[PDB]
Every structure is written in structure tokens, then in C-alpha cells.
Enzyme design. Structure first.
Site, PDB file in Angstrom:
ATOM      1  CD  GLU A   1     -12.018   1.043  -1.215  1.00  0.00           C
ATOM      2  OE1 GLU A   1     -11.682   2.209  -1.196  1.00  0.00           O
ATOM      3  OE2 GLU A   1     -11.270   0.105  -0.754  1.00  0.00           O
TER       4      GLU A   1
ATOM      5  CG  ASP B   1      -4.953  -0.790   3.064  1.00  0.00           C
ATOM      6  OD1 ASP B   1      -5.390   0.297   3.292  1.00  0.00           O
ATOM      7  OD2 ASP B   1      -3.685  -1.048   3.108  1.00  0.00           O
TER       8      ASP B   1
ATOM      9  CG  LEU C   1      -7.586   2.091   8.180  1.00  0.00           C
ATOM     10  CD1 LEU C   1      -6.500   1.140   7.641  1.00  0.00           C
ATOM     11  CD2 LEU C   1      -6.964   3.450   8.244  1.00  0.00           C
TER      12      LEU C   1
ATOM     13  CG  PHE D   1     -14.652   5.760   0.989  1.00  0.00           C
ATOM     14  CD1 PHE D   1     -13.904   4.612   0.729  1.00  0.00           C
ATOM     15  CD2 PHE D   1     -15.815   5.622   1.748  1.00  0.00           C
ATOM     16  CE1 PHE D   1     -14.322   3.364   1.241  1.00  0.00           C
ATOM     17  CE2 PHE D   1     -16.242   4.395   2.266  1.00  0.00           C
ATOM     18  CZ  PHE D   1     -15.464   3.255   2.036  1.00  0.00           C
TER      19      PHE D   1
ATOM     20  CB  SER E   1      -6.301  18.480  -8.868  1.00  0.00           C
ATOM     21  OG  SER E   1      -5.083  17.865  -9.123  1.00  0.00           O
TER      22      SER E   1
ATOM     23  CG  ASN F   1      -2.592  19.084 -11.342  1.00  0.00           C
ATOM     24  OD1 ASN F   1      -2.962  18.904 -10.155  1.00  0.00           O
ATOM     25  ND2 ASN F   1      -1.381  19.533 -11.601  1.00  0.00           N
TER      26      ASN F   1
END
Ligand SMILES: [Cl-]
Ligand SMILES: [Cl-]
EC number: 3.2.1.17
Length: 162
Positions: free
Chosen positions: A11, A20, A32, A104, A117, A132
Site C-alpha cells: 500500500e 487511490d 480509505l 484489507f 476460489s 481462478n
């Protein structure tokens, strides 16, 4: 290596509000602020989160504190989510970090939608899951980061981050 370092790599760390990869206002280590298009709205959410009039800038300590909270929240979201908890419980420690990274980034709800998945990860069918997982918008939009997380599930090691 661990969850905190891993996310710190993915990040980054910014001390002024920024946008972002989806163009939403963010700050710190991927925290965020709002999906609204308004910068004022973002400065408002920021001050409310830090507890002072920030004027859009925070210290390192403040970023870290947000980060800590966000990581905790992610675990707890996993553990309360019926589709996630079982997966998480079945995995080993490195792979749990990969599931946390995804939660996250995209939220509990977004990850819980990777039904197929998830099932594969629960069965420990590594290569299949990896294939996948790549068939997703997530992968096409942030391919390098997604490759790192995917390799992590496939191999159960931290090589992608070394
Ligand atoms: Cl908050
Ligand atoms: Cl990326």
C-alpha cells in the site's frame, strides 16, 4: 515478514490525502477515507478519524495508528464472516496473511464473493485456486499486487515479497 510489513509494501505510506488506484481519497497506509468525490468530505472524515483538525495532513504515528486499527478490523471481519471464517481457519499462517491482504484491500464483502476460489483454497488445491483468482477484475486492475498475493497462496512462502 508478516501481515503488517506485507501490507506496508503493497500500500505504501502517504501523509497527505491522496487518491487511490480507483480515484478515492485515502491517506496513510491504504486507509480509505470516502468514496465521495468531495475533498471536503474527505477532510471531514479525516478529522473525525484522527480526532483533531488535521487540515489533510497527519503524522507517521497517526498513520500507524490507523493502520493498526484497520488490520485488527480486518481479522475481526474475517472471523465474523460465515463464508470467510472457515477458510481462514483451514489455512496455514502465511496463507492467512494473503487472505487478510485481500480483505484489507477489497473488504469482506468483496472477498466473500470469490466463492469458487475460496472453495479451492479450502480444499488446498493451490494451483487451481491461483488460476481462478486471476480471472477477476481485481487482477486486471492491480495486476502486480494481485500476482504477489496469488503467489503467496500458491506457494505458502513469502518469496514474492522478498
Ligand atoms: Cl476510523
Ligand atoms: Cl498493482
Amino acid at each position: 515478514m508478516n501481515i503488517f510489513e506485507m501490507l506496508r509494501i503493497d500500500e505504501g505510506l502517504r501523509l497527505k490525502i491522496y487518491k487511490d488506484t480507483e480515484g478515492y481519497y485515502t491517506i496513510g497506509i491504504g486507509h480509505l477515507l470516502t468514496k465521495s468525490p468531495s475533498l471536503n468530505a474527505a477532510k471531514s472524515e479525516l478529522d473525525k478519524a484522527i480526532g483533531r483538525n488535521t487540515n489533510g495532513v497527519i503524522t507517521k504515528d497517526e498513520a500507524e495508528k490507523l493502520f493498526n486499527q484497520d488490520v485488527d478490523a480486518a481479522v475481526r471481519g474475517i472471523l465474523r464472516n460465515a463464508k470467510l471464517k472457515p477458510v481462514y481457519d483451514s489455512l496455514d499462517a502465511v496463507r492467512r496473511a494473503a487472505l487478510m491482504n485481500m480483505v484489507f484491500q477489497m473488504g469482506e464483502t468483496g472477498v466473500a464473493g470469490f466463492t469458487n476460489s475460496l472453495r479451492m483454497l479450502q480444499q488446498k488445491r493451490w494451483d487451481e485456486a491461483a488460476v481462478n483468482l486471476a480471472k477477476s477484475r481485481w487482477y486486471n486492475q492491480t495486476p502486480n499486487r494481485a500476482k504477489r498475493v496469488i503467489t503467496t497462496f500458491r506457494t505458502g512462502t513469502w518469496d514474492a515479497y522478498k
